[PDB]
């Protein structure tokens, strides 16, 4: 066939304890150890290397790629930091991509302090495009490659900070996406955490890009973590796990058991978030994160703490001094915000609050008020914990619960993984701590495992994407078969091929080898008893049901036994009774294994379950009342032997109609096939020879090595499958009928416009502009109208709307409905009423009020939205904006390019596109 | 010897034993 599978093997160097180095290599070639470095370094480093680092380090300067999986505060960065070193030492070009804008922007401080060449990319902002290090976000590097080569132009490296964000749904296709598009004489550096499956990881970069990839792995923590559990009612907090990484069993029980007794009906005041930061300051703990999954929650347990300070008089100027200089930026109209007010006292008192519903240049404050160790007790949401490594010495928990669906969960080991790796400070704590809040029962098993246990694996989260597929046809060299193909999560589900494939073969050569039965016929014979073996264990099911067997079981009936494959012959019952199903007592011949066919055999007593009976007699032959002795033992199998001689043509058996009641209808049709494949049976020429049984078992291991090629192709022909294909064929067939691409997947001018927008619905709003929606609408309404498309994050009551307002939006969802019928006309998986209501709006009136030129005070009093989301949608709708202007041009259409542009205006001021800290 | 029994036996399952 023509399987264009991975072919790729894996190969462990040595290394010194304290890290793990392997490679994943290409099968034909032969591995070559890494050679030495020559000549002096690209880069030393204020401090002495770890194992890891050395190995990684050595890895670039072979120009091999690397994944690096350390926890987080390992010292990752090192490794990158060499190879941007390395790449402006040979005046090459590099690429340090991060998944979060916020997290580039600090990412770029830290490059441009450090080396100064370098510049930034995201959708916000741009800073020295031509720089030979730029930090750029995902999102913009596949747009870069989709664009033009330029963006590789002499580019030898690219570092990939954090693969986790591919696990992520809204944004880890995209990073698949790009690795899948990079050239293959590019070398990658890969930045990850423990996860169990970076080997796979490797093995996706060498099949997908010919090249070796290193595996560098080590669980050092640089500080050692004690994780404490705090039982919901309880005093205080008990030891779950030591520095040593040991499971306390011991206390972690006794925990629990005060969490069973702890609420009502199993036995004002403060809060219980409260008295645990509140000792943590008593028992030098501080500085401590507190991550809370509700905004509304962080806020409230902040502002608790509000009665208590953390920061001396000295810290309090300073906290003022660094607050008002941060601002000084700020209008004056912007500076009386009643969330300016509401968070300053909280920061003089030490107290700190991080989580997206903050303003972005608040938020900003708030963190480098906390690199300075001014800000001692901070709750934060969990956001925080997926950013830069600002970490503190104590991590507590809140809650343990997160909602996902219609159902509650506990929160992932991989999570708390995430979080708790931020308590512990390098060179500032012998040992961070963590503490869990508990208020549910919680099994030890899954304590074991959520606290000790490893990071979830890291699986692909790969699916289709319009703006995918209509990029996927612009480029005349790639197919959007090929994407998938290439994709790791079709590795992961083609990871089965490589051991079924060599099996086939083996198995393949070891049938022909014992095809050597003198005649076909035989197969006939084979077959003909395997039918025979079949139905006789249909007919003891039958005859096991306790119903209709147990009433003939009386002392002294003979009885065929059979387990698993061995069986005992005959035996002779004595009594039966109920057991933990039944039990009767049966003298067999011989936790004994039966007797062999060349010994005489002893009787011996055993019970045995009722559903291991094959057959049962008419014969009841009689017993010694004591059957203690042997020699009765052998009696009784010298009166089988008797009764074996009176009837040679076979012990009789019950009739299990005419005799033991079985008016089962199923049961009439066994028999009928019994004796009709007997009769074949007889009459097969091959019954009588001698020789039968030395042919009949050359047969039956022809057989089961043919049993074994059958299963193995078919999970062949799965593993070998390609999952999503009948998506894309649906895909294909929606921008067909709407004319985005032909019939020969060849782009349409539609489709060129479909491609720039890639940060909303490009097929609704390509189909929307192409209808002359947006013609008569004004740069104010269409923008508003546009915010639809760009608050995905919605989850509050809508607002009364304009007439103004609600035309365009009424106009926009007939388009969403004949994109929903379309699609569904194609047969995809879509819930029309869902489609319509994706597009929440209701930020429709503040967009609006705010492009009229609104101050930012006078639109916040419209809705109950925390005012950073406010500002995060409309950076959304900027970029989206500038993106719809693109589109307009690729079409030449310079009125529609002129209305956007007039949006990005009136919308582009004051504090929402306030420069953040950090640029 | 041995013979040859195709009848079974049967219990009350309302009977008070004592
Ligand atoms: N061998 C080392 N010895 C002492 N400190 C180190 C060492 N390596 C890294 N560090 C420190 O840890 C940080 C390195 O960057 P980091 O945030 O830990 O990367 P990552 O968390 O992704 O692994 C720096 O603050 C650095 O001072
Ligand atoms: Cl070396």
Not at chain 1, 20 to 27: D, G, Q, Y
Not at chain 1, 470 to 487: A, C, G, H, Q, T
Not at chain 1, 723 to 735: A, F, N, T, Y
Request: aromatic share 8%; hydrophobic share 40%.
């Amino acid at each position: 066939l023509a399987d264009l599978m991975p072919r790729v093997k894996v190969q462990s160097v040595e290394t010194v304890e304290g890290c793990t180095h392997e490679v994943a290599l290409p099968a034909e070639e032969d591995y070559l150890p890494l050679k030495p470095r020559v000549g002096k370094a690209a880069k030393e480093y204020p401090f002495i290397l770890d194992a890891f680092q050395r190995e990684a380090i050595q890895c670039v300067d072979n120009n091999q790629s690397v994944l690096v999986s350390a926890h987080t505060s390992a010292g990752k960065t090192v490794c990158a930091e060499y190879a941007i070193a390395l790449a402006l030492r040979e005046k090459q070009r590099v690429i340090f991509t991060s998944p979060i804008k916020a997290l580039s922007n600090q990412k770029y401080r830290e490059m441009y302090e450090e080396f100064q060449d370098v510049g930034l990319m995201t959708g916000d902002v741009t800073i020295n495009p031509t720089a030979s290090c730029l930090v750029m976000t995902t999102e913009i590097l596949r747009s870069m490659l989709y664009r033009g080569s330029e963006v590789m132009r002499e580019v030898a490296w690219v570092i990939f900070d954090e693969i986790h964000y591919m696990r992520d749904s809204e944004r880890g296709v995209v990073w698949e996406e790009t690795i899948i598009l990079l050239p293959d004489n590019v070398h990658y550096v890969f930045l990850s955490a423990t996860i169990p499956n970076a080997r796979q990881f490797a093995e996706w970069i060498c099949h997908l890009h010919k090249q070796p990839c290193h595996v560098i792995y080590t669980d050092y923590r640089p500080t050692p973590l004690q994780h404490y559990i705090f039982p919901a009612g309880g005093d205080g907090l008990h030891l779950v796990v030591d520095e040593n990484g040991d499971f306390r069993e011991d206390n972690f029980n006794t925990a629990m058991q005060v969490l069973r007794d702890a609420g009502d009906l199993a036995k004002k005041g403060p809060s219980n978030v409260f008295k645990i930061v509140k000792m943590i300051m008593e028992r030098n703990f501080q500085p401590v994160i507190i991550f809370s999954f509700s905004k509304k929650d962080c806020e409230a347990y902040a502002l608790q703490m509000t009665k208590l300070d953390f920061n001396t008089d000295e810290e309090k100027k300073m906290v003022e001094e660094v607050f008002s200089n941060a601002i000084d930026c700020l209008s004056d109209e912007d500076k009386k915000l009643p969330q300016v007010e509401h968070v300053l006292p909280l920061l003089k008192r030490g107290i700190g609050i991080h989580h997206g519903g903050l303003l972005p240049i608040l938020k900003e404050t708030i963190e480098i008020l906390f690199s300075e160790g001014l800000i001692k007790a901070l709750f934060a949401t969990e956001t925080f914990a997926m950013g830069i490594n600002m970490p503190a010495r104590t991590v507590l928990f809140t809650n343990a619960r997160k909602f996902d669906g219609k159902d509650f969960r506990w929160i992932s080991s991989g999570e708390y993984i995430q979080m708790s790796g931020r308590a512990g400070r390098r060179g500032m704590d012998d040992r961070g701590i963590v503490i869990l809040m508990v208020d549910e029962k919680m099994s030890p098993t899954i304590g074991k495992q959520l606290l000790k246990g490893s990071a979830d694996p890291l699986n692909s989260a790969f699916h289709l994407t319009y703006n995918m597929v209509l990029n996927l046809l612009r480029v005349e060299e790639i197919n959007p078969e090929y994407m998938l193909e290439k994709s790791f999560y079709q590795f992961q589900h083609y990871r089965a091929i490589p051991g079924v494939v060599e099996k086939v073969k083996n198995s393949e050569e070891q049938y022909n080898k014992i095809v050597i039965p003198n005649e076909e016929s035989v197969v006939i014979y084979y077959k003909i008893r395997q039918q025979l073996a079949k139905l006789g264990k249909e007919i003891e099911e039958y005859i096991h049901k306790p119903k209709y067997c147990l009433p003939f079981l009386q002392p002294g009936r003979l009885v065929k036994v059979k387990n698993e494959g061995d069986d005992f012959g005959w035996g002779v019952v004595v009594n039966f009774s109920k057991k933990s199903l039944y039990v009767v007592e049966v003298l067999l011949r011989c936790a004994a294994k039966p007797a062999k066919p060349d010994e005489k055999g002893e009787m011996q007593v055993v019970p045995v379950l009722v559903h291991l009976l094959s057959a049962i007699s008419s014969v009841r032959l009689y017993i010694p009342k004591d059957l203690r002795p042997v020699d009765n033992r052998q009696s009784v199998l010298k009166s089988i032997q008797e009764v074996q001689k009176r009837f040679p043509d076979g012990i009789p058996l019950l009739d299990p109609i005419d005799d033991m009641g079985i008016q089962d209808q199923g049961l009439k049709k066994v028999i009928q096939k019994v004796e009709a494949f007997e009769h074949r049976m007889y009459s097969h020429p091959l019954h009588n020879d001698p020789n039968l049984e030395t042919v009949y078992t050359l047969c039956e291991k022809k057989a089961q090595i043919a049993i074994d090629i059958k299963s193995a192709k078919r999970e062949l022909k799965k593993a070998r499958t390609v999952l999503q294909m009948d998506e894309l064929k649906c895909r294909k067939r929606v921008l067909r009928r709407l004319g985005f691409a032909t019939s020969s997947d060849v782009i349409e001018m539609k489709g060129r416009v479909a491609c720039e927008i890639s940060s909303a619905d490009e097929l609704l709003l390509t189909e929307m502009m192409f209808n002359g929606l947006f013609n008569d609408l004004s740069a104010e309404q269409a923008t508003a109208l546009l915010s639809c498309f760009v608050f995905q994050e919605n989850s509050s009551e809508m607002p009364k709307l304009t007439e103004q307002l609600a035309g365009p939006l009424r106009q926009m969802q007939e388009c969403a409905k004949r994109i929903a019928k379309v699609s569904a006309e194609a047969k995809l998986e879509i819930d029309e009423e869902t489609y319509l209501s994706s597009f929440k709006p209701h930020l429709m009136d503040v967009v609006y009020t705010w492009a009229t030129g609104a101050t930012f005070a006078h639109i916040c009093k419209m809705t109950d939205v925390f005012e950073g989301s406010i500002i995060r949608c409309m950076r959304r709708l900027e970029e989206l904006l500038r993106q719809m202007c693109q589109a307009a041009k690729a079409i030449g259409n310079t009125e529609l390019e002129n209305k956007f542009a007039e949006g990005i205006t009136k919308i582009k001021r004051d504090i929402v596109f306030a420069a953040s800290l950090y640029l | 010897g041995w013979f040859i029994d195709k009848t079974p036996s049967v219990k009350k399952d309302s009977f008070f034993l004592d």
